[PDB]
């Protein structure tokens, strides 16, 4: 309707006098720590109710209808889990039997501390790759070769397959303990704002470039070539050239088998996703392609006939717990910190997707403790880092999943695949397992189509995507995440250092002020020049704030005062012998200021002092209360710059000048 | 007087229709690049005048009295500068004559490109300490010892003084050449915003730590003790422990002489600073104490009698130019970058001080270019990095200085002290030169008294002072500057990630809105809840923004919908068988937003969608045009969330809500 007000021009002091303030809360640190820790039984039961989420949904189960859906979904993901687990184990340089352990022990721990319902904890292609980089860099192949075999001329320095795996397993298991501890520290100390720095373009660009390194790494298994485990700078570029140089030393059997299941698993996946309305339950294409693979490889002995690469290394048994090799945390702390954060970032991202669709909330701090205890419990049983794969958790939700009981039943399928089953997968070719991983890389390879979308959107978000994608390819993969966080935080500083300053003018017959570079019919007060400056002034944009003022007034407060004294010598010598035209005032619309950064507030007192010497007043328009209370402490309100210079509304500053020139020409 | 307005409630569309916008400037990069480079002679004359500032003040001289003033200031500053150079030569591990060289050529170079008038370019204690640390880390003492001298049992591995000085001088020349190249690159590319990151507390803490390290080094030199040139982590602590262990192996004469000259110089300096009104020109205490030291040390032969440490290494002659040892840039790039940055920062600080004290302006890029050319010209004549010392430039201002001619006369003093004089300073003890440096450390040691002042002020800036001071002591000195800039940027990011959110309410009979946590008599509209959020929303403060919304509304937009759908199943099953109370709207006062970081506008749209499902409208109050134009591109205004939801003024949203609840119950 109508918007009419009638109030005096309360600048700063006409409003601060009659308005009583609130008494601030006293320090009383002695009572604060006492009031924090409660003694009632409600607080004691509350902290345990959220620490062990099993006491929430297990007593409130729905055996009538929920138990039936968990069994059919458990046996579904159990077959997909035991195959993806043994396939992702090749990305971490660990033997194939330790991949099944990563799909059994972490699930048993994510049943009493987990705060999700539709998350299948297990291996992950990106996370297992980062673990494999640590195992290869701290235990290479040329560090275990023993000279034996009565060679021709020199010592028979043959491969030392066998006892070499014990150096890789103890190294991978020790890494997971450090990963679990870091997650417990972030969850215990309630510090979770570090994961907020991993923006969606940063994680999207990181996973896209990580999919390339997985593609090159898995291509080595498909072509059955032998690289030199190049690690460091341009690791993916160097290993890609070595594969092309060793194309002749490939295996036709592994190539024709690996490329065949690549087309089959990908075509059926896109056919099932597109034609979802026909059949609700996705057909286990990854499972049926493995059963037919081990069946063909068993009849025709591809190990002896075509010299293919088979597993033939499944002992089909458990192992006693082994203590981690403590002492290697110094050379792995940098890599473990990156793995622990990227594992939690993917866990929450995938978890929140299936949380808003089934309308339930997932706690953030509990997710750290949940994966923290799982990684520690898996480290004591020779496992690698546990996460949640989007492809594996999609099977548990599509086939019907309600609680974590579907995952517990999925652990029984992996359970029988270790004690009794597992030996049947002996003649399975490693190229088939190296292909089901590439078939799931389609979800991350299609993320490149978001770069043109982010370019039409905020351009700074598209640069972070390309920066992280390239930096996670040139300089390793763990350093790419660190080089992306620093570049992302630097972009935030660049946006608050170079703000969007305008020339706000007045709209006729109203009180609203809009930018002069966006509208035409905006009138400005005669003599007054209004300037808006977002991105509150700090030590970095304090010099730019001076340039913004000099640009909107047309002159410089230093050169004008210099020319005055340079010309005043002629005026003061006439007795012995014998520019700032338009600017009347400067109303600074500092309404978007958040902090002060006293290093920068010293210039605000200087700016008023500079313009006061050239007969120009520098008023303020929209300073907040939390900033004005900060100026009083930083030594700004002296016997010259009083509070009357500040105002509450931008139109109040103009009314103060218009009423001042009428009573004083 | 009175502040009355009368306008309709223009929310977003009632104001955007009748208000014509301005046509944006076309890209036309061809004409922009063509219009950038000018063809007229005026632009060429201007760039030549601003590149070589000698053509400005030299033809406009005032010989009559300026000649005598510049002559006296030049002889005084020449004495002071040759003393400071022969003193700082010990901090750079180079011989004494090379300090005199570094105090001669940079002054001649800063005469045609310099843009200041009261700057005495030369050595500097901090820069000399950094150069000496680099030289010691890249050329230690145990890397040149030759076994010779027919020792007792093992090889007589005596000291190899001599040819080591050539290697140190070549290394220092390469370092200063790289510094000059980096400065020229920073100046020509017009990139000067990197120096803005060096805040005043950061520079203060860095200078305090550098003064502490200089004190430790000069105490090592005075006591005549030999350390193991420890460099790296905790270098100052290690060398202090080594000095304390080797106290017995000192020289009584050098120690007592150093203590006496320290006391004398400090007493005379404080007496001249306190009683300034008595005598205007400061008495050259350094000059007279050096004269009396070299006079006493010549009569009584302190070299043979008391076995004191004298110079006895002044050849008193020039040297042909030497080409720098190019190829060592890889192992000194970071050190040269830090040295150039700190030198330019100190130079700009001193120039701005002595320019605002004499009412003139000094350019930044021209200063960078001038210092780069000076360092490049000094690198070709066996010198180190050049800067301006606050103690040396104070003499040129106190004794009377108008132009850089005082520097040209100051070079003639060093000129006559290099070719002919200088040999008279042969018996001068190194402890006397190592004491004037400590006497000049009083200005930086008193900066510790600013920590209590910055604590009462903005506390985040007082932590940067202590953080930089400690980090530049534990982990070297060059890394402390890098560890301070990153910490400062992280502190800036933390201030824009955790904003100061309030509960703004309405003041009766007015239209201004103040924080509810600062005033008592503030009334809020029935049902409406206003929330202000500074520090524009980005990928880091999205969860913080959600938490602030949930705290200001009292509930959670997800848990309420969860409970609604969990209670709705009981309602929809009765046919088969047979919270959000106070919150009516949420006006977000997003007036302090600068950018939106589309990852954040996605969360904004998600919030608006979530609150729409619980019958709660989320309006906006003070969104700027530069943010709305970004939201229009980021895919926010769909067929459901129109622009009518946005408003121009905070009171307009309240008026609209009141009209809606009056016209519709």
Short mmCIF file of C-alpha atoms in Angstrom, two decimals, chain B residues 84-415:
data_model
loop_
_atom_site.label_atom_id
_atom_site.label_comp_id
_atom_site.label_asym_id
_atom_site.label_seq_id
_atom_site.Cartn_x
_atom_site.Cartn_y
_atom_site.Cartn_z
CA UNK B 84 76.32 1.55 8.58
CA UNK B 85 77.61 -0.22 5.47
CA UNK B 86 80.87 -1.37 7.03
CA UNK B 87 78.78 -2.50 10.01
CA UNK B 88 76.11 -4.39 8.04
CA UNK B 89 78.76 -6.07 5.88
CA UNK B 90 79.31 -8.42 8.83
CA UNK B 91 75.62 -9.39 8.88
CA UNK B 92 75.81 -10.52 5.23
CA UNK B 93 79.00 -12.62 5.72
CA UNK B 94 80.68 -10.49 3.01
CA UNK B 95 83.92 -8.52 3.58
CA UNK B 96 83.83 -4.93 4.74
CA UNK B 97 84.62 -3.17 1.44
CA UNK B 98 81.57 -4.72 -0.23
CA UNK B 99 79.35 -2.93 2.28
CA UNK B 100 80.94 0.32 1.15
CA UNK B 101 80.27 -0.75 -2.44
CA UNK B 102 76.62 -1.47 -1.60
CA UNK B 103 76.45 1.98 0.02
CA UNK B 104 77.77 3.71 -3.14
CA UNK B 105 76.25 2.33 -6.37
CA UNK B 106 72.59 2.02 -5.24
CA UNK B 107 72.68 5.71 -4.27
CA UNK B 108 73.92 6.65 -7.74
CA UNK B 109 71.22 4.49 -9.32
CA UNK B 110 68.44 5.92 -7.12
CA UNK B 111 69.04 9.38 -8.58
CA UNK B 112 67.51 9.01 -12.04
CA UNK B 113 64.67 6.55 -11.31
CA UNK B 114 63.88 7.40 -7.69
CA UNK B 115 60.54 9.01 -6.88
CA UNK B 116 61.37 10.22 -3.35
CA UNK B 117 63.45 13.04 -1.90
CA UNK B 118 64.07 12.03 1.73
CA UNK B 119 65.19 8.41 1.25
CA UNK B 120 68.78 7.32 1.90
CA UNK B 121 69.08 4.10 -0.08
CA UNK B 122 71.64 1.62 1.21
CA UNK B 123 72.05 -1.45 3.40
CA UNK B 124 69.50 -2.51 6.01
CA UNK B 125 69.93 -4.75 9.08
CA UNK B 126 66.99 -7.06 8.32
CA UNK B 127 67.81 -7.43 4.62
CA UNK B 128 71.51 -7.89 5.40
CA UNK B 129 70.63 -10.56 7.97
CA UNK B 130 68.47 -12.40 5.43
CA UNK B 131 71.21 -12.22 2.78
CA UNK B 132 73.76 -13.50 5.30
CA UNK B 133 71.47 -16.36 6.31
CA UNK B 134 71.06 -17.33 2.65
CA UNK B 135 74.83 -17.17 2.10
CA UNK B 136 75.51 -19.29 5.19
CA UNK B 137 72.87 -21.84 4.16
CA UNK B 138 74.21 -22.06 0.59
CA UNK B 139 77.94 -21.78 1.44
CA UNK B 140 78.88 -22.98 4.94
CA UNK B 141 82.29 -22.77 6.59
CA UNK B 142 82.99 -26.53 6.52
CA UNK B 143 82.68 -26.51 2.70
CA UNK B 144 86.00 -24.73 2.02
CA UNK B 145 88.47 -25.99 4.66
CA UNK B 146 91.71 -27.30 3.15
CA UNK B 147 93.97 -29.75 5.07
CA UNK B 148 97.34 -28.01 5.36
CA UNK B 149 99.59 -26.90 8.20
CA UNK B 150 101.44 -30.08 9.27
CA UNK B 151 99.19 -30.77 12.24
CA UNK B 152 99.93 -32.96 15.25
CA UNK B 153 97.99 -36.19 14.64
CA UNK B 154 95.33 -35.71 11.93
CA UNK B 155 95.27 -33.43 8.89
CA UNK B 156 95.65 -29.74 9.77
CA UNK B 157 92.18 -28.68 8.60
CA UNK B 158 92.64 -24.99 9.34
CA UNK B 159 90.36 -22.12 8.36
CA UNK B 160 90.45 -21.12 4.69
CA UNK B 161 89.68 -17.41 4.94
CA UNK B 162 90.37 -15.79 1.60
CA UNK B 163 88.95 -17.60 -1.43
CA UNK B 164 85.76 -18.15 0.60
CA UNK B 165 85.04 -14.41 0.49
CA UNK B 166 84.91 -14.57 -3.31
CA UNK B 167 82.30 -17.35 -3.22
CA UNK B 168 80.25 -15.46 -0.63
CA UNK B 169 80.42 -12.24 -2.68
CA UNK B 170 79.39 -14.05 -5.87
CA UNK B 171 76.47 -15.65 -4.02
CA UNK B 172 75.36 -12.30 -2.57
CA UNK B 173 75.63 -10.70 -6.02
CA UNK B 174 73.48 -13.44 -7.55
CA UNK B 175 70.95 -13.03 -4.74
CA UNK B 176 70.68 -9.26 -5.13
CA UNK B 177 70.45 -9.61 -8.92
CA UNK B 178 67.54 -12.02 -8.52
CA UNK B 179 65.95 -9.59 -6.04
CA UNK B 180 66.28 -6.75 -8.54
CA UNK B 181 64.83 -8.90 -11.32
CA UNK B 182 61.83 -9.85 -9.16
CA UNK B 183 61.30 -6.19 -8.25
CA UNK B 184 61.47 -5.13 -11.91
CA UNK B 185 58.96 -7.85 -12.80
CA UNK B 186 56.61 -6.67 -10.05
CA UNK B 187 56.98 -3.06 -11.18
CA UNK B 188 56.59 -3.52 -14.92
CA UNK B 189 53.66 -5.94 -14.69
CA UNK B 190 51.87 -3.35 -12.47
CA UNK B 191 51.20 -6.10 -9.90
CA UNK B 192 51.59 -4.33 -6.57
CA UNK B 193 48.65 -5.70 -4.59
CA UNK B 194 50.88 -8.50 -3.26
CA UNK B 195 52.62 -6.01 -0.96
CA UNK B 196 49.24 -4.93 0.45
CA UNK B 197 49.04 -8.29 2.25
CA UNK B 198 51.85 -7.17 4.59
CA UNK B 199 49.74 -5.62 7.32
CA UNK B 200 51.21 -3.29 9.93
CA UNK B 201 51.15 -5.86 12.79
CA UNK B 202 52.69 -8.48 10.49
CA UNK B 203 55.55 -6.16 9.52
CA UNK B 204 55.94 -5.11 13.15
CA UNK B 205 56.29 -8.67 14.39
CA UNK B 206 58.62 -9.56 11.53
CA UNK B 207 60.83 -6.56 12.32
CA UNK B 208 60.82 -7.45 16.03
CA UNK B 209 61.92 -11.02 15.33
CA UNK B 210 64.53 -9.81 12.83
CA UNK B 211 65.85 -7.34 15.41
CA UNK B 212 66.09 -10.18 17.94
CA UNK B 213 68.04 -12.31 15.46
CA UNK B 214 70.29 -9.34 14.59
CA UNK B 215 70.93 -8.83 18.31
CA UNK B 216 71.88 -12.50 18.66
CA UNK B 217 74.22 -12.34 15.65
CA UNK B 218 75.89 -9.12 16.79
CA UNK B 219 76.30 -10.58 20.29
CA UNK B 220 78.01 -13.56 18.68
CA UNK B 221 80.28 -11.14 16.81
CA UNK B 222 81.04 -8.98 19.87
CA UNK B 223 81.88 -11.91 22.16
CA UNK B 224 84.26 -13.18 19.42
CA UNK B 225 82.76 -16.68 19.58
CA UNK B 226 82.50 -19.16 16.72
CA UNK B 227 79.22 -21.03 16.26
CA UNK B 228 78.33 -23.76 13.74
CA UNK B 229 76.12 -21.46 11.60
CA UNK B 230 72.96 -23.34 12.52
CA UNK B 231 70.19 -22.68 9.99
CA UNK B 232 66.69 -24.07 9.67
CA UNK B 233 64.28 -24.70 12.55
CA UNK B 234 64.98 -23.07 15.93
CA UNK B 235 68.19 -21.55 14.58
CA UNK B 236 68.18 -18.58 16.97
CA UNK B 237 67.61 -20.80 20.01
CA UNK B 238 70.37 -23.17 18.91
CA UNK B 239 72.90 -20.40 18.31
CA UNK B 240 71.99 -18.75 21.62
CA UNK B 241 72.55 -22.05 23.44
CA UNK B 242 75.86 -22.44 21.62
CA UNK B 243 76.90 -18.91 22.64
CA UNK B 244 75.95 -19.61 26.26
CA UNK B 245 78.00 -22.82 26.17
CA UNK B 246 81.02 -20.98 24.72
CA UNK B 247 80.98 -18.00 27.10
CA UNK B 248 84.40 -18.94 28.47
CA UNK B 249 85.96 -18.69 25.00
CA UNK B 250 85.38 -14.95 24.68
CA UNK B 251 87.63 -11.87 24.53
CA UNK B 252 87.51 -9.48 27.48
CA UNK B 253 88.76 -6.46 25.53
CA UNK B 254 86.27 -6.77 22.66
CA UNK B 255 83.42 -7.41 25.10
CA UNK B 256 84.18 -4.41 27.33
CA UNK B 257 84.70 -2.17 24.29
CA UNK B 258 81.38 -3.26 22.80
CA UNK B 259 79.55 -2.75 26.09
CA UNK B 260 81.10 0.70 26.56
CA UNK B 261 80.22 1.87 23.04
CA UNK B 262 76.71 0.41 23.39
CA UNK B 263 76.16 2.38 26.60
CA UNK B 264 77.64 5.57 25.13
CA UNK B 265 75.68 5.40 21.87
CA UNK B 266 72.38 4.56 23.59
CA UNK B 267 72.83 7.33 26.17
CA UNK B 268 73.69 9.94 23.55
CA UNK B 269 70.80 8.81 21.32
CA UNK B 270 68.24 9.03 24.13
CA UNK B 271 69.66 12.38 25.30
CA UNK B 272 69.38 13.78 21.77
CA UNK B 273 65.87 12.37 21.32
CA UNK B 274 64.56 13.72 24.63
CA UNK B 275 66.33 17.11 24.53
CA UNK B 276 65.57 17.85 20.89
CA UNK B 277 64.50 21.47 21.49
CA UNK B 278 68.01 22.40 22.68
CA UNK B 279 70.01 21.38 19.59
CA UNK B 280 68.17 20.78 16.29
CA UNK B 281 70.88 18.80 14.46
CA UNK B 282 71.56 15.38 16.04
CA UNK B 283 75.19 14.94 17.03
CA UNK B 284 76.81 12.07 15.03
CA UNK B 285 77.46 9.76 17.97
CA UNK B 286 78.30 6.86 15.63
CA UNK B 287 80.91 8.91 13.77
CA UNK B 288 82.66 10.21 16.89
CA UNK B 289 82.58 6.81 18.60
CA UNK B 290 84.07 5.14 15.51
CA UNK B 291 86.75 7.85 15.37
CA UNK B 292 87.67 7.44 19.04
CA UNK B 293 87.63 3.64 18.67
CA UNK B 294 89.98 3.63 15.67
CA UNK B 295 92.16 6.19 17.48
CA UNK B 296 92.47 4.20 20.71
CA UNK B 297 92.93 0.92 18.82
CA UNK B 298 95.81 2.44 16.83
CA UNK B 299 97.84 3.82 19.74
CA UNK B 300 97.53 0.73 21.92
CA UNK B 301 97.89 -2.18 19.50
CA UNK B 302 94.83 -4.20 20.50
CA UNK B 303 95.59 -6.76 17.77
CA UNK B 304 98.87 -7.89 19.36
CA UNK B 305 98.51 -6.83 23.00
CA UNK B 306 94.99 -8.02 23.88
CA UNK B 307 94.46 -10.20 20.77
CA UNK B 308 91.35 -8.29 19.70
CA UNK B 309 89.37 -8.76 16.51
CA UNK B 310 90.15 -6.05 13.96
CA UNK B 311 89.19 -5.61 10.31
CA UNK B 312 92.67 -5.44 8.70
CA UNK B 313 91.10 -6.46 5.37
CA UNK B 314 90.42 -3.19 3.53
CA UNK B 315 92.31 -3.08 0.20
CA UNK B 316 91.08 0.50 -0.44
CA UNK B 317 90.28 0.18 -4.13
CA UNK B 318 87.55 -0.49 -6.65
CA UNK B 319 87.08 -3.68 -8.68
CA UNK B 320 86.00 -4.47 -12.26
CA UNK B 321 82.39 -5.59 -12.77
CA UNK B 322 81.77 -9.32 -12.41
CA UNK B 323 79.04 -11.28 -14.17
CA UNK B 324 76.63 -12.92 -11.70
CA UNK B 325 76.73 -16.70 -11.27
CA UNK B 326 73.46 -17.42 -13.05
CA UNK B 327 72.07 -20.88 -12.37
CA UNK B 328 71.51 -20.68 -8.62
CA UNK B 329 68.01 -19.18 -8.91
CA UNK B 330 66.24 -22.48 -8.19
CA UNK B 331 67.66 -22.80 -4.66
CA UNK B 332 67.23 -19.08 -3.85
CA UNK B 333 63.96 -18.08 -5.55
CA UNK B 334 61.84 -18.06 -2.38
CA UNK B 335 64.53 -16.28 -0.37
CA UNK B 336 64.95 -13.61 -3.06
CA UNK B 337 61.17 -13.18 -3.24
CA UNK B 338 60.89 -12.69 0.52
CA UNK B 339 63.86 -10.29 0.57
CA UNK B 340 62.43 -8.20 -2.28
CA UNK B 341 58.99 -8.09 -0.67
CA UNK B 342 60.23 -7.02 2.77
CA UNK B 343 62.66 -4.49 1.28
CA UNK B 344 59.94 -2.88 -0.85
CA UNK B 345 57.57 -2.87 2.13
CA UNK B 346 60.06 -1.12 4.42
CA UNK B 347 61.01 1.32 1.66
CA UNK B 348 57.38 2.24 0.95
CA UNK B 349 56.70 2.65 4.67
CA UNK B 350 59.64 5.00 5.25
CA UNK B 351 58.84 6.91 2.06
CA UNK B 352 55.19 7.40 3.00
CA UNK B 353 56.24 8.56 6.48
CA UNK B 354 58.78 11.12 5.27
CA UNK B 355 56.38 12.16 2.48
CA UNK B 356 53.34 12.85 4.67
CA UNK B 357 55.71 14.61 7.07
CA UNK B 358 56.85 16.92 4.25
CA UNK B 359 53.57 16.98 2.25
CA UNK B 360 54.43 15.27 -1.01
CA UNK B 361 53.44 12.07 -2.81
CA UNK B 362 55.50 8.98 -3.69
CA UNK B 363 54.58 6.48 -6.39
CA UNK B 364 54.60 2.75 -5.72
CA UNK B 365 55.35 1.18 -9.09
CA UNK B 366 58.05 3.77 -9.80
CA UNK B 367 59.61 3.03 -6.40
CA UNK B 368 59.55 -0.68 -7.25
CA UNK B 369 61.20 -0.06 -10.63
CA UNK B 370 63.82 2.22 -9.07
CA UNK B 371 64.75 -0.30 -6.38
CA UNK B 372 64.86 -3.08 -8.96
CA UNK B 373 67.22 -1.11 -11.20
CA UNK B 374 69.35 -0.20 -8.17
CA UNK B 375 69.64 -3.84 -7.10
CA UNK B 376 70.44 -4.93 -10.67
CA UNK B 377 73.16 -2.28 -10.98
CA UNK B 378 74.56 -3.25 -7.56
CA UNK B 379 74.62 -6.93 -8.50
CA UNK B 380 77.04 -6.18 -11.35
CA UNK B 381 79.51 -4.51 -8.96
CA UNK B 382 79.74 -7.01 -6.05
CA UNK B 383 77.06 -5.66 -3.73
CA UNK B 384 73.99 -6.96 -1.91
CA UNK B 385 70.34 -5.94 -1.69
CA UNK B 386 69.75 -2.23 -1.09
CA UNK B 387 66.99 -0.65 1.01
CA UNK B 388 66.49 2.44 3.18
CA UNK B 389 67.23 2.46 6.91
CA UNK B 390 64.99 4.54 9.17
CA UNK B 391 67.98 5.63 11.27
CA UNK B 392 70.04 6.73 8.26
CA UNK B 393 67.21 8.56 6.50
CA UNK B 394 66.43 10.43 9.72
CA UNK B 395 69.78 12.23 9.48
CA UNK B 396 69.03 13.48 5.96
CA UNK B 397 65.73 14.92 7.21
CA UNK B 398 67.06 16.37 10.47
CA UNK B 399 70.17 18.01 8.99
CA UNK B 400 68.01 19.44 6.20
CA UNK B 401 67.27 17.62 2.96
CA UNK B 402 65.22 18.75 -0.03
CA UNK B 403 66.09 16.58 -3.06
CA UNK B 404 68.18 13.53 -3.91
CA UNK B 405 71.23 15.76 -4.42
CA UNK B 406 71.91 15.08 -0.74
CA UNK B 407 72.31 11.45 -1.76
CA UNK B 408 74.65 12.31 -4.63
CA UNK B 409 76.86 14.21 -2.18
CA UNK B 410 76.49 11.26 0.21
CA UNK B 411 78.01 9.06 -2.51
CA UNK B 412 81.07 11.32 -2.76
CA UNK B 413 81.83 10.63 0.91
CA UNK B 414 81.75 6.88 0.28
CA UNK B 415 83.69 7.56 -2.94
#
